[PDB]
């Protein structure tokens, strides 16, 4: 019922009380595990806004105090009579901290305790949301000083009138396909594309298309917006050895922002409730750049470093990937937009992992994310075993609207 | 109930049903998933369902099963178990048993032959020198002179648990580690432990950066005795680059042969504790680990520093540099002295395939993705994008304590 988490790299034992407070599930039983597995009323809310309550106020050392009590009380009150509650501005900013915090799959949580939170809960139409978010971008953006930032919707009422951002991210690359059969632009956003079209975007049919927003305010129909040019920050891709990594013409954007997650606080829901940190260098340059069903540019560069990819033994695709990363790091510290290295990144995070054991009795951690997507072993994290539950407040994945939405 | 994994690069979606079959514990809960924890004397009473299970697997996979040798043969084990509180398995049992501990080893990325296995039966061994000379012939004929074979061999089962066949190293073939009084480590930082204890038992130690240990060997529960593998049946692969010449003067070397010593093989409820096996190397297992691991070998640095790296911030990607020439040159001078290895895209490639033929023909495969993606370079494998169910059948290989911290010392 108490576990331990060793290191093998330092023999250092972490002892997990944390645990013993989750509430929701992993899909794994005593039977199997599912740890690699991407996705596995009135009466309902009371125990939830309870359990957050009863967590904030002890957070606040008032654990059991007449405020404590009167809170629990009116809050009880006004779902008895409205079916619901609002939260108060200290409880949502608690609340979306804490969502992070307990991110089980999020490597940058060190920074946890720093996030802005930008309350938009009076929004009631797309061009509003459209302000909020364009305001958002700048904020975190900070002319490439970046800076944590959620902005949080009005919560779900009946299902039938939902905040939704539609894009999985505020700032992502078009997705076209060819009757060459091939792929123009990020494969990812192929569909999400389609609809923007359909819905009415005039698409430019290049290669590194920011996406317009497409806004769902109200349970109403979305609507397209264009973010501010100047708003999106943008990086060249250069090598500082190779000069020919010019010519292939790859870019970047500065702001990794996800809104496509749903918030859940104290029982309620914020189905729209985009955050943004900084990007890892990994994620673009491993993940971005080189998977199979992305922007897959590795025997293109292979090539233009010559090197020998008859045999998959040379490790050419190795030594491609490396001089890759180089690369993304190199321009974006050049460019001076923030950017973190997996070395440092999972460093900051033992560190992390260490203070929340020590200061909180654990820390959930999703192995299968945490570690990067190359040279795995030779960051700490690999070393380290880590305990996954899922504990509340949280960021949960939704479905996506357009299967859901009744137009 | 039907389960799915499904691959996020190519779609496919697979169904596993062979997880209804599993048994054992896992260490996940509902509410907890312990799926990237390292670790997480049998009465008559649970050994003949333990039996009778293992043995209706035996008697389908032949197309025999409900057969009156099928019924004879339940007759005959559970007649030996209530007589004897145990029982012996048929030649033909054991060979079924070992091939299929290791087809369930959710950990091991090299199923894809694991319908290739010599199995060698030790079961009429009785001494330390017995075992010295099985472990001495296994270790000749999987080598191959480089051509390297599959092979497990097995030791006689456990009884009352103070009789019990252990080899004590970890590996058959592993290099000693010696701490200096400043702190430092020589050799293998490993096996300093071990190597402590070998020394203690009397073992000369040559004190060098790569001294191929002695075998530590119990027989029938009584002290563990020494012995040193001839030296002409190690076989060892000198460490040089293609292109990098001053690679070869770091003075590195590694054997060829990877066996495992210290697994117990779990088969129908009888107990293996001795069961050495070996494979072939990916070159990942010590161009990755071996060498660079910070508590192994750890040549990052000195490898680094020879290729001129700007080691001033990591964000110089310095260590993945000099962790890819590296594994360069493991795989470049194994395949230069022919002795067999693989790269980890051609394993993970291969392994996708054995998995995928696994769910078809079987059912499932089970599999441990935290163990089963390689230490570097892991998406731009195909096994990070795969999902995988991890679950235990048996038989199974399975961890067992170290001897020393159990053992009842004789005199
Ligand atoms: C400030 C620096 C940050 C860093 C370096 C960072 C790093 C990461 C990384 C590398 C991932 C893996 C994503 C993937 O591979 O798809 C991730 C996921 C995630 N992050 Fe962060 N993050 C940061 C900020 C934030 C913030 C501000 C929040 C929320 C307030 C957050 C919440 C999450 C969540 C919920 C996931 C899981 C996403 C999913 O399941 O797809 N992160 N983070
Ligand atoms: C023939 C080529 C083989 C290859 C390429 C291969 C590859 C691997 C690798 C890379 C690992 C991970 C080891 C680690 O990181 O500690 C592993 C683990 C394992 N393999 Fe193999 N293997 C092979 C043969 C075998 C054989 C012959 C057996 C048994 C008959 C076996 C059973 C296992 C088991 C039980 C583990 C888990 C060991 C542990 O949990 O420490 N493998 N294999
Ligand atoms: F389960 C899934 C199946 C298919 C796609 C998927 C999308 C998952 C990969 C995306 N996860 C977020 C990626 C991302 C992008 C931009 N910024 C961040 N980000 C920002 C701060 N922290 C993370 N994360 C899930
Ligand atoms: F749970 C643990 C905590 C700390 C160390 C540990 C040892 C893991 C490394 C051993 N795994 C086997 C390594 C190995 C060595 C040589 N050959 C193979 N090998 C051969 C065939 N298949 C694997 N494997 C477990
Ligand atoms: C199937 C497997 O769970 C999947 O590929 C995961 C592996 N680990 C990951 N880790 C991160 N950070 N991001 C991802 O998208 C994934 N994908
Ligand atoms: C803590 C973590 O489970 C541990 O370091 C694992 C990670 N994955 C691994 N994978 C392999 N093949 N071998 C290992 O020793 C490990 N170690
Ligand atoms: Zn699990």
Redesign the pocket.
């Known amino acids: 019922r108490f576990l331990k988490v060793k290191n093998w790299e330092t023999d250092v034992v972490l002892t997990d009380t944390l645990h013993l407070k989750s509430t929701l599930e992993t899909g794994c039983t005593e039977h199997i595990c599912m740890g690699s597995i991407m996705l596995p009323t009135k009466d309902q809310l009371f125990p939830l806004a309870k359990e957050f309550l009863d967590q904030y106020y002890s957070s606040i050392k008032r654990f059991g105090s007449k405020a404590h009590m009167d809170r629990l009380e009116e809050v009880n009150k006004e779902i008895e009579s409205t079916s619901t509650y609002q939260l108060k501005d200290t409880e949502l900013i608690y609340g979306?901290?804490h969502?992070?915090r307990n991110?089980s799959?999020?490597?940058?949580?060190i920074?946890?305790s720093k996030?802005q939170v930008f309350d938009a809960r009076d929004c009631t139409t797309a061009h509003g949301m459209f302000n909020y978010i364009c305001n958002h971008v700048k904020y975190a953006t900070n002319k490439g000083n970046?800076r944590?930032?959620?902005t949080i919707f009005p919560q779900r009422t009946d299902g039938k009138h939902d905040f939704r951002v539609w894009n999985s991210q505020l700032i992502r690359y078009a997705g076209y396909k060819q009757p060459d059969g091939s792929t123009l632009g990020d494969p990812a956003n192929v569909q999400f594309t389609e609809i923007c079209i359909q819905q009415g975007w005039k698409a430019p049919r290049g290669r590194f298309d920011v996406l317009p927003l497409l806004l769902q305010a109200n349970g109403n129909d979305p609507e397209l917006f264009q973010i501010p040019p100047e708003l999106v920050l943008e990086v060249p891709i250069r090598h500082p050895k190779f000069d020919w990594f010019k010519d292939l013409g790859l870019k970047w954007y500065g702001l990794?922002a996800?809104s496509n997650?749903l918030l859940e606080i104290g029982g309620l829901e914020f189905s729209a409730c985009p955050?943004?940190?900084?990007?890892?260098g990994?994620?673009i340059g491993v993940?971005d750049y080189c998977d199979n069903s992305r922007y897959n540019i590795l025997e293109e560069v292979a090539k233009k470093m010559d090197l020998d990819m008859r045999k998959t033994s040379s490790l050419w695709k190795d030594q491609a990937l490396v001089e890759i990363n180089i690369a993304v790091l190199y321009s974006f510290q050049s460019d001076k937009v923030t950017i973190?290295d997996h070395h440092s990144?999972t460093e900051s995070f033992i560190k992390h992992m260490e203070n929340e054991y020590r200061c909180r009795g654990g820390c959930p951690a999703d192995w299968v994310?945490i570690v990067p997507?190359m040279s795995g072993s030779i960051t700490p994290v690999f070393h380290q075993e880590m305990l996954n539950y899922r504990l509340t407040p949280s960021?949960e994945?939704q479905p996506d609207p357009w299967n859901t939405h009744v137009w």
Not at 105 to 109: A, E, F, K, S
Not at 275 to 280: D, K
């Open positions: 979306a901290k969502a992070w991110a799959r999020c490597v940058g949580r920074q946890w996030l970046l944590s930032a959620i990794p996800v997650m955050f943004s940190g900084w990007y890892m990994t994620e993940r973190v990144a994310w997507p960021f994945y």
